Amino acid sequence: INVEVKHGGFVYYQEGCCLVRSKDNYEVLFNLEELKLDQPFIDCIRVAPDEKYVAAKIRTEDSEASTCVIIKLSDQPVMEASFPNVSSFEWVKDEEDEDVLFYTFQRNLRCHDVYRATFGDNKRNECFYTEKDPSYFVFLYLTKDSRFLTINIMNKTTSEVWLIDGLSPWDPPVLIQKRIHGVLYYVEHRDDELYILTNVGEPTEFKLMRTAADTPAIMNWDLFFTMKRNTKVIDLDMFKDHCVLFLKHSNLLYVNVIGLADDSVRSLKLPPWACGFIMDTNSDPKNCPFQLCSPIRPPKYYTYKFAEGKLFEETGHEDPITKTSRVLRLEAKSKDGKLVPMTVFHKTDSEDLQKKPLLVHVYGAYGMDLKMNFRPERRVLVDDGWILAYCHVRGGGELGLQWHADGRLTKKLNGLADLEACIKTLHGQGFSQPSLTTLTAFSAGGVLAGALCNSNPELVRAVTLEAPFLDVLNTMMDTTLPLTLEELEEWGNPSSDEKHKNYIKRYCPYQNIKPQHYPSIHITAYENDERVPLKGIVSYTEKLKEAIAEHAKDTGEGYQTPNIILDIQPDSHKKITAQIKFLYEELGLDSTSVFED
């Protein structure tokens, strides 16, 4: 998370709790200690275009709030100004060469606001934008050629964009298009012509719409390029001559190189193991660098040189796991006949007897997808002979908006059905038998893991949960604390409508704990959180033990009892180590899991 900003040809990074300017020799612009903060970590650095000032925002743990500190970038590394609670900021070079800082903070929870800080003649904080609606978030973005500073007013379903001239920082912002509910727009400039990324008209289809910078209304927009329906745009990298569009769909990645000054589109060939895209913020201006990664392979560097056909792998580092592990894309068939993508990872020199411990990962909530970034512990499990699988199930977002809508408020059980289908499908393919199956889930995904434990316990041997959202019904029916509308729409309100109360009762894993055989379950939980009360987990743990205890008393006759383990913490490696030891003990695998990280 270490912030790195390169400008003026010298990079600026935070080291030793002090703002540092690097050409092993560095110059300290500021000492973060003076701010009287504990463990202050720099989240954002923005360097004035003419290097007179540098601004950065500094945050500490256990604080929602952070402060933006402005240092003179002059030979004097002294403080110029500071401003608390700044969400974002950016610099614009005035026509008088005055580097003015635009920044966004919030006047209480009432509204957010954009101010322009002038230092050279002491004009300080002039207001350029004021907010009216607390549900929207104001964020600043300047494009690459600094033609237009953009004020982005955003929500998840809709956005509004206002432009501030990069050649006239004092002018009032100009609205491109008044907000339309359900429509989000992102704006980039090429040559007194704008390209707009938008889902106007059709919510499930993002498209490239072009228009003159002086003719911003929707009615004047033409069509430049369209993406496949329900694909996810992760990024759009604008250049003078072309743009590079980065897309994801399902479990496939695509890169589209689209000429703008030359209307011809080019698709790039990506390797089959890539499961996600890492974007660079080096903003190099005559190349489009990016990295590809997978949960079992550290990020690799690729660069597209708009100039030549292809010179992508400039990186000299490569990992043999590319050839020693295989990435299968195998969909499962649901109870209602739908296809549920699943990503499966296994060794290519694996034995004919494909009956090895299988780890299944599920989230299935809030429209989120499963993060595919590299995790050394997951790779080790594969090196030891583990088969990993990721289930892209209803309630998440990999296949479109309807995937979030389904497997949700009145239909959560569909996410459960998709998880069940995935597990049975893997067993059906023959990767593992139930005795070697392991399931893992986090926070919201714990609902699905819990519910599966109650409905089909014979499918899993051991389950590993982190701070799971288990007692859904009491958490949701807690009228004392108002339920956030966001959640209220991710879990029906049982306090206002009996059908939600009944639907939730039907899937809530706490409520449905019943005397029967269970998988061994290890729970990692924390002392202090807001989303997952510890008392919920403790009650679950106590009730779960009682159910299996009653089961064991009537039918056990010497049979072993599933190990129910609750580990409370106020370190990631310690957590991982404990989880691996738990699973290996349950799976009777022993331990040679030695690694460098």
CSV table of C-alpha atoms in Angstrom, one decimal, residues 2 11 47 73 145-146 219 310 329 332 340 359 395 412 426 434 473 505 509 515 548 551 557:
chain,number,residue,atom,x,y,z
A,2,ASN,CA,3.2,2.2,0.1
A,11,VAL,CA,10.1,9.8,-7.3
A,47,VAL,CA,3.0,16.9,-6.9
A,73,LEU,CA,8.4,21.9,-2.8
A,145,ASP,CA,-2.9,16.2,-20.8
A,146,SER,CA,-4.5,18.2,-18.0
A,219,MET,CA,-28.4,14.5,-27.9
A,310,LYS,CA,4.1,-6.3,-30.1
A,329,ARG,CA,-12.7,-23.2,-16.7
A,332,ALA,CA,-21.4,-26.3,-12.9
A,340,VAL,CA,-22.2,-21.4,-12.8
A,359,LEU,CA,-10.2,-26.1,-1.3
A,395,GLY,CA,-25.1,-13.0,-5.3
A,412,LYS,CA,-30.4,-16.1,-1.4
A,426,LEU,CA,-16.1,-31.2,-8.9
A,434,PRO,CA,-16.2,-35.5,-0.1
A,473,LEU,CA,-31.6,-13.1,11.5
A,505,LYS,CA,-35.1,-17.8,9.0
A,509,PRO,CA,-27.2,-20.9,9.5
A,515,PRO,CA,-28.5,-32.0,15.8
A,548,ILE,CA,-23.4,-32.2,17.5
A,551,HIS,CA,-26.1,-36.1,18.0
A,557,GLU,CA,-20.9,-45.0,20.3
